A paper describes a structure:
We previously selected artificial binders to the αβ tubulin heterodimer (tubulin) from a library of designed ankyrin repeat proteins (DARPins). Here we applied cycles of randomization alternately with selection steps in order to identify higher affinity binders. This strategy led to evolved DARPins that bind tubulin two orders of magnitude stronger than the parental one, resulting in complexes with subnanomolar dissociation constant. Biochemical and structural characterizations demonstrated that the affinity increase is coupled with the destabilization of the ankyrin C-terminal capping motif (C-cap) of the DARPin, which in the parent DARPin interacts with tubulin but needs to undergo a rotation to avoid a clash. This remarkable order-to-disorder transition illustrates a new mechanism for affinity maturation.
We next determined the structure of a high-affinity DARPin (namely the TM-3 triple mutant), not bound to tubulin. These data should allow us to establish whether the evolved DARPins adopt in solution the conformation of tubulin-bound D1. The structure of TM-3 could be determined by molecular replacement taking D1 coordinates as a search probe, but only after removal of the C-cap from the model. There were two molecules of TM-3 in the asymmetric unit. For both, there was no electron density for the C-cap. A comparison with D1 gave an explanation for this observation. The longer side chain of the Arginine residue at position 118 in TM-3 compared to that of a Histidine in D1 led to an interference with the C-cap, hence to the destabilization of this module in TM-3, making it mobile and thus invisible in the X-ray structure. However, the comparison with the structure of D1 also indicated that the C-cap would clash with neighboring molecules in the TM-3 crystal if it were folded as in D1, leaving the possibility that different conformations of TM-3 coexist in solution but that only the one with a destabilized (mobile) C-cap is compatible with this crystal packing.
Author numbering: 11 to 141
The structure:
């Protein structure tokens, strides 16, 4: 039979907000992970799907879920450059100073990418310049 968690990951990545809600109401685990540890929240945060990020969080998504590389959804939003998603993640308790496998924080990632508005937001939320 079909895997609801795999469908939830695909709906979160595709930006299908109606399907995300339906899947979860029918038993899809909000914290379903693929082979690399990516959750629906990691995918919605990467693809810039703000409403899906908010829906996932309201349904109990782990805001600080880490994949095999230690990337939290905040790392992914800061790297790509989704400002409103960074702000929503921080509001829901994202670890501003989370360090991935390469020793990078969301602040480092936003800085190297030249995402200055995100840099300022992270710093205002307690990003440690020495982490």
């Amino acid at each position: 039979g079909s895997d609801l968690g795999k469908k939830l990951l695909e709906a979160a990545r595709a930006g299908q907000d109606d399907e995300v809600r339906i899947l979860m109401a029918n038993g899809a685990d909000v914290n379903a992970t693929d082979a690399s540890g990516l959750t629906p929240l990691h995918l919605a945060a990467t693809y810039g799907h703000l409403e899906i990020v908010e829906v996932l969080l309201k349904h109990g998504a782990d805001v600080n879920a880490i994949d095999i590389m230690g990337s939290t959804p905040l790392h992914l939003a800061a790297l790509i450059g989704h400002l409103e998603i960074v702000e929503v993640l921080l509001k829901h308790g994202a670890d501003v100073n989370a360090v991935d496998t390469w020793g990078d924080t969301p602040l480092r990632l936003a800085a190297i990418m030249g995402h200055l508005e995100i840099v300022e937001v992270l710093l205002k939320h307690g990003a440690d310049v020495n982490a």
